[PDB]
């Protein structure tokens, strides 16, 4: 698409996760955005990506943005492992 | 700042210009964001940058997002020359 990169950036900058969408969908959604932008030459590294993910991460997931200060060199895969583990406990 | 690039992206993705802020401030604001992101490795070329500027460009500046289809290879400097010319005539 001619307007692909712009639409991926706007989606990435306005992520809103609370626990309604399954973690499976939300992960692949963000992972695809980062991969699509990187294929077009826009590299969003782990540091900048994690910051944008934790931004808007609300509900019972708000705390991940608080502990992030101790978490530098964090990876996107690690950040989603945290979100997944919370979703598992949200189903039961 | 440790959170500079992320804050630059959110600002670039939620630009809202109507004609209240002077074009001088709005131009240097966006131009600095693009330069900072390119220096940090987040390459935002003219095509994607202009698209993001025209997004949220509302008020009497809406029509620039309509003519953008005939305007390919339009540089950021060219897009602001348009915005400037509308701002000068607005007062």
Residue numbers in the entry:
A (entry chain B): 261 to 352
B (entry chain A): 261 to 351
Pull text from the paper.
Excessive replication of Saccharomyces cerevisiae Ty1 retrotransposons is regulated by Copy Number Control, a process requiring the p22/p18 protein produced from a sub-genomic transcript initiated within Ty1 GAG. To minimize genomic damage, p22/p18 interrupts virus-like particle function by interaction with Gag. Thus, p22 is identical to the C-terminal half of Gag-p49 and is processed at the C-terminus by PR to generate a mature protein p18, that is identical to the C-terminal half of mature capsid Gag-p4525,27.
The p18mAUG2 structure was solved by multi-wavelength anomalous diffraction (MAD) using crystals of Se-Met substituted protein. In both structures, the asymmetric unit (ASU) comprises three copies of the p18m monomer. There is no additional density for residues 249 to 259 that constitute the additional N-terminal sequence difference between AUG1 and AUG2. The co-expression results show that regions of Gag required for CNC comprise residues M249-N355 in p18mAUG1 or M259-N355 in p18mAUG2 and imply that the nucleic acid chaperone domain of Gag is not required for CNC. Dimer-1 involves a largely hydrophobic interaction between the exposed surfaces of α1 and α3 on two opposing monomers whereas the Dimer-2 interaction is through the side chains of residues exposed on the exterior of α4 and α5.
